[PDB]
Paper text:
The 26S proteasome is composed of a 20S catalytic core particle (CP), to the ends of which two 19S regulatory particles (RPs) are attached. The cylindrical shape is formed by four stacked heptameric rings, with the two inner ones composed of β-subunits and two outer ones of α-subunits. The multicatalytic properties of this proteolytic machine are provided by the subunits β1, β2, and β5. All active CP subunits are initially synthesized in a precursor form with N-terminal propeptides (β1pro, β2pro, and β5pro) that are autocatalytically processed upon CP formation.
Author numbering:
A (entry chain U): 6 to 245
B (entry chain X): 3 to 205
C (entry chain 1): 1 to 111
D (entry chain S): 10 to 129, 132 to 248
E (entry chain Q): 2 to 61, 64 to 246
F (entry chain O): 12 to 58, 61 to 189, 192 to 196, 199 to 245
G (entry chain P): 2 to 230, 232 to 247
H (entry chain R): 3 to 242
Write the structure that this text describes.
Amino acid sequence: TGYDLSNSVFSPDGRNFQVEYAVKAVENGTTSIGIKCNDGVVFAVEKLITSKLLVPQKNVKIQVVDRHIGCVYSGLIPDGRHLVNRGREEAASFKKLYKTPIPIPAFADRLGQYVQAHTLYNSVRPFGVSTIFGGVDKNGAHLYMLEPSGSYWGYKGAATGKGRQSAKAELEKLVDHHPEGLSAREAVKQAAKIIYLAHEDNKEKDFELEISWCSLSETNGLHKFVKGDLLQEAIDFAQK
Amino acid sequence: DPSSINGGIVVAMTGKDCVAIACDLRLGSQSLGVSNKFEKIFHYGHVFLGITGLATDVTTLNEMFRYKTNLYKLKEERAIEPETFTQLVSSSLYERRFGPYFVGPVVAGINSKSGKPFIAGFDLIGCIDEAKDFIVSGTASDQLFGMCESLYEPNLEPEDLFETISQALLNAADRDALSGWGAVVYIIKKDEVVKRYLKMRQD
Amino acid sequence: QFNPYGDNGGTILGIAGEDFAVLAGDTRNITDYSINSRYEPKVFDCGDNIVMSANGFAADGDALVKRFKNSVKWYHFDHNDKKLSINSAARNIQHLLYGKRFFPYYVHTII
Amino acid sequence: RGVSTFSPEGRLFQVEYSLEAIKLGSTAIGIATKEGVVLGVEKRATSPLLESDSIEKIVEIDRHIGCAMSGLTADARSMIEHARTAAVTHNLYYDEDINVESLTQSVCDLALRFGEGASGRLMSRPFGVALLIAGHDADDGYQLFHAEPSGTFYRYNAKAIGSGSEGAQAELLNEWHSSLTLKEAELLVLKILKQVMEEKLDENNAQLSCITKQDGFKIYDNEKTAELIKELKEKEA
Amino acid sequence: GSRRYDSRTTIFSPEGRLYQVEYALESISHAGTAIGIMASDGIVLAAERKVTSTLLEQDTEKLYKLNDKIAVAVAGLTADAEILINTARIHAQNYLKTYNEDIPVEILVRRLSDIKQGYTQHGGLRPFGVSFIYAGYDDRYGYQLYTSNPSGNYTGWKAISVGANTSAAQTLLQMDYKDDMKVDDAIELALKTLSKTTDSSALTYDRLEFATIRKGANDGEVYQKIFKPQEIKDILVKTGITK
Amino acid sequence: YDRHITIFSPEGRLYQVEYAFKATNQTNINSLAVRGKDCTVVISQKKDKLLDPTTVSYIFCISRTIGMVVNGPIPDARNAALRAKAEAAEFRYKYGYDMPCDVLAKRMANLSQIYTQRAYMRPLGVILTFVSVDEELGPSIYKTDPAGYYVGYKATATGPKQQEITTNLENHFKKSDHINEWEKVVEFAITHMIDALGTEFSKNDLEVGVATKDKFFTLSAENIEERL
Amino acid sequence: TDRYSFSLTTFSPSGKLGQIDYALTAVKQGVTSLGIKATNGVVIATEKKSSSPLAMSETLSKVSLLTPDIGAVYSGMGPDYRVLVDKSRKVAHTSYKRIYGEYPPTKLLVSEVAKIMQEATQSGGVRPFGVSLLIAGHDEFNGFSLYQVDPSGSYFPWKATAIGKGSVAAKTFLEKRWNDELELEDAIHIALLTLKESVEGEFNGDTIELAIIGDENPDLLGYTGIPTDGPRFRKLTSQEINDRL
Amino acid sequence: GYDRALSIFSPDGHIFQVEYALEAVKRGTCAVGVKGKNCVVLGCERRSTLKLQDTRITPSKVSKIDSHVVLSFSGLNADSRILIEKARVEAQSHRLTLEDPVTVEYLTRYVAGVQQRYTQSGGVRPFGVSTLIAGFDPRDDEPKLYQTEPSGIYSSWSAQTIGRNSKTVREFLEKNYDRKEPPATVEECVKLTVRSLLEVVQTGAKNIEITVVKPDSDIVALSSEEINQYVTQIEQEKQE
Amino acid sequence: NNYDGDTVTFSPTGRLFQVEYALEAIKQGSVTVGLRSNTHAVLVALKRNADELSSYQKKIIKCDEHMGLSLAGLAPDARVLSNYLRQQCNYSSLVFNRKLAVERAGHLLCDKAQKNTQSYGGRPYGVGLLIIGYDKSGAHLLEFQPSGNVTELYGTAIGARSQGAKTYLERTLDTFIKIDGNPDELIKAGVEAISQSLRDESLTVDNLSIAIVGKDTPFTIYDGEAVAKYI
């Protein structure tokens, strides 16, 4: 009843309703997906073309942290940009202190602490974004998803946004059918296919597909967008 | 040296169930005598304090210790004893470890509960020197040491203690250019305090 | 023991005519007895038909010139693109110089 | 609801309420011609024992800039101090008179300071007073501006503020033309003030001031205003 | 934010009143009675103990000393009163240090009143729920009696009462008071007023605090005496209460 | 109201603290801690194909000797874990010897009490169980709650189904303190949990933390299967 | 972020500070604790309740040494008492011992604790402490003393008193057995008898905590050599309590 | 710190705290000031408090801000003391900086500025005081009177009353005070002030205080005997 | 509605009502249109006046020699944002001898707007902005909303009744895309687009303002007689 009007107020059942409302805000965004392959990660996202006056291939959504971390988010885009700026500051501080690129689990913990710190007071608002991020470090490839409550986990495949249910079903089938794993290019094709399938929930507007990847054998452990013939091949595979 | 600008000397001795504290009266700037009525001895209840050094620092420390002793009496509902006042003086001095007061304080008293005379001296940063015989301070400290190591006896009646401390003070002050324009002696018993002004050559 | 200043040499000259002004400068930059460069201009056109030269320690002079150009830009922004006259520029430069009264620019300025 | 809350229509509550407060003030009229700008105010004395010479609704910001106020006139003193300081500091920094529009923009930036400043909170509420700023500069000649606690200012050929602003402005719409002389502007200001004032107009209930390039800002004495009122009465009847 | 939980302790009412100040006065009106009487040669303070009136209560709470010449009687919260008393003691010592003279009573009273008023005007904190009766001596006016309330107002009185039965005590004190009374007559009047206004079976010695400020009594110019329970019992026997 | 911030109710209660206690049971996971007179053993009941199981854990390594288990939501759990690690490191730097388990528990309980007394701070809806083998006290289990209350235990259990485990432990101790046996203590705790709850916990259904004299570590799934 | 700069404790229209009254209610819901002052000592006693049967109740002590000659006990909220004890020890060191070289008297330390408790009822954004404290001490110039401190910062000196659930009955019992001539053993016996009434479970040495301010204990002073150097405060072991039972 | 906006605007454009401060001024005792040909007279009403009040030590309402300037008030007494202290400090500072004592108008403007600042600043409440400021400018023989209000408005006035039944006294003044021929001697001004005060204060002549201000810093507080003489003369002339 | 008090409160459906109220403030402003080609970028603005005796409110603000914007909504917020953008461009030039890219300025505005919708004590801005510029990548047009969203478009319109102009721009996209080297034609296309949002008024020299930037053209503003040839 009255327990939903302020952040960091426990309900009688032990709930924080402002965080749940932030999750509701997240559920109204576009679909973002991440796939973990044998030696890297692939991030894919759908961008709605509200008007034909939007310049194609501009308005980039996927963002980069340091030179090896990829991040995408669903929800209120400015909140995601705020979180990415904070993550860039954290990575810079870690690199300055310890002369090594920040490991992915450490970056995930720093982001989680920052998100969680916004559920502790009623003078601030929880972040309205769910973030799928990851990359490659000395231990290998890592993929994580972070929720508005500050909780995060590592995933074999993650999906968020309005079309999250169908994307999760497709990811589960993909994981079940490939116990050994997937290559980076095959992961790019599958991400294109899954984004196209998940868009079928929202047929009212056209969409553009954006894909990025970070792999040891394809980008030498750096994060790079997919823009050339590979992007067209993935689009053709998805539309097939 | 700020400590040797104004001049002045203070002595303290223990005799039987009694104590004695004496000081000179001169106040001069560098070599010109300004005042012959500058007393360096104050008392807060039954505890006596004599301060040598910069006259400004002497007055400031007297005012500050009067402040602190009044507040102590208000909170504790009893007068402060010499043994606790010594610790208070040491802490007050060490709180200015780097901007120190250029002072030579000496504490003399009789403990109300025990009746034992107590005496102590301090440097400018609050190091405590406890003595069973005597304490000296001022520009004529070496002369005072020479007089006291020869004239003092372990147990003296107040009448004899008066003569001993007075002669030590006068003969040490007559060999110090910056000390001596008058002299005051305090003889302190359990229930009586006597103050005497000595006759001196002035110059 | 650091000596944040230098000399850098150079010579400038300003002459005012009946309907014109002239500001001339040497183009030689030296440290003590070596030549840093033979063509390093020290006279600049700082907008609104105003020319400026701050001769002496080169770093301080460059900083002062950059600050004055920025001041002209903000004067245009804040006053509806009004032309900055020469006396107003002189006063603004006086304030810029006196803003470092106790750590001054080591230059002689002519506009 | 804080002091910086948006209404569902897209407006700030405190600014609208301050405008309502301004609507309760006494009437001030400004008229701009090519021979100078005229400002005029009514002196709303509460009691017969109140000495009207102590009521000062028209103040000088600089030799070439004057101002009149309406509403909570106590709040205007801080803004007047700010404007005088801005003009004097501009003269110090640039050896030139400040433009009227720049001074008005500085005053509006100050008025914004119940929230975020113009360059990135000095008070807990917006001002409750509106200003008529008259001036002359070499770039734009004679100018009249209306400044409001919303941080927005306008330029007017003629403007009226205060309790009787609507009727006075309606009269100004039908009576202002670009060929008005200074004396005609003075008579028009007096006539509109007499129309909007409940009390009978005289040399004590109202005062006039003028800004010219030659003589600068000046406030008329009571004798000159009385002569002008007599001239207006004779001309009208 | 936290705007909902703010009670706005420093705002006016539509009638021009401060709610917190009035409520603190009402809180004080339920505390033990204190009375101050000034005669031509001294001052008497008498505080009737109200709380913690039990047999196993060691006397070892209402009368306090500020300096060697000024004392106070407290009505209200004891801990807030102790805070203000510590501040007043520090102020008196600061004045002595600066000017090498004893602080006049009015200056200290006005300083305490200003401290009280500050909590009423600015900040978001509750006012002090304490009323003080000051009894002091100075070379300007001689013997002085003051009172100060949470509103920050201080007033000088010949005879005053603060506490549970201020109306009845003041009505009693308006009569039977003369400008030429002595210290013993003032003591008798204070005890009689306390006995008449007491809402208890008897006015015993263990429910009272007494203090006098006069001249002499094994002291110099001015002596402050805080009565022991035995002295209070002897005074009660002498006056006629015999309780 | 008094039910939104940490102020007293008319009955002297603090509703936000009680609601945080309720929040401590958001995850239906039970944990059990026992002592073996030479070691300390904690076992937790971790329970989607998309998740990476190795990243899911409620057992933290606060320092070389101190281990922690949390009951409650994972964000507050990680908040507390980071705070405890920082406190232990600061203690070791400042005082020159390893932080003991009981002192760390007291420090965390003091922080929780601060949360319960300050309005702008909300309590953390977690229950913290610290285990170690102290060089002065031997095996040690200490537990702190959102109210600021902490105590040491011979053995303890946390979760929704904690009454059954507590009753079974008390019956075992009455039969007869500690366990007189680290692997044997681990198997004892596994069997105790199985008997208290039911079914057969596979290697993926539990996580085990073991604290020995100079170390605290966590067993892998292969080690847990080896116990089974 | 922290915008709670306003008092959470305010006067009601009737003149009552509600939060302090609620803290007093929380105290009155707490377990019983007692203090008795004899001619040659002071006894402070309390009941030890265990949250769980598997909890080592020895690790939690409701009686705490403040100074070698001053100890304390409480009724109310445990964590508040723990924090208050830490603060009281720190204030004892930083306000008196570092200035005069001696531990403070009982009354001055009680006054400092009362100041700390009062500040929590007027400063912004805080809740008053929900405890009541009994403090027992000895000093050279005042002898033995016992004090009670309330959540509002009011403190009173007591010949004997009790706080907690069974406060009224224990107070009546102690009133009926006061004679101004008791010794330490008599006070300990009276305290045990009064506690036996207010304890519902087992009444032994593992469910009672007793402490005494008595005579100096040279054995509890890990060095020899200074004639003027004693810790009067002493906590009775469970074995001694069982023997006295 | 505490910086809540206590004084804000209402939907009708009013600031309620200022109006309530004006009501607080209304609750205060009645003060009056009159201008003479060469003097200013300030009259105040004493509250009918208990007869056990000591007149020597109680504050006497009329306070000398400087040897040539006095101030009286109506409203809360302690707030008035704060304003009086600020005015005295400012007068000394001005005399220091400009080598001349303040004018009456300058001090009035300073006090009004303090009141306005409290009306506009955050975390404080406005003063519940209205003030009358009287005096003579240095080397000037022109009487000066001014009134200041909680909002910050000030004006000069030839005769003015504040507090409680100030309307009746103001009507009496308007009926009896002539601008063309103000009272010539000090006695006439004192008589007018006393007669105006007697219109609301029927509790006797004991509760009336009179202060006379004359140029070259001539400030005299009349004794109770003189005020009683004036009152007896007025009573005698009342009937015949 | 109890959820619209401040900007730190979500609704049960996950909406920020103060942001929506700021958007409503935008929707009541005068229409402005932005357009661009591969070589030039253009802003067209319809001014408004209080009454006949009043001047018209300015709507176009120059940020730097290669960049400017037009506003719709609360003008002081536009002044604050424009001053911030001027400072950022000046910093880029002073420190790197570099002309700030349009996309980076959009990012900066997004970041500055986001911080005002997540913390207590501050309101979101109440203005929408159309930003034109020319940099090393050519001509750019951006649309900024106070929620923090910034979009890059070929053309757009904001303010009251901007839908007609937006539809006109969407229909004639391929035409104005290729108006390279002919600034007057692009300006006339923009004027025709803004003519679609007029209902009871006609464009005059007093209520029409135009701005243009381009490959060789610094950001320039035309008003008054300077627009008489475009009417």
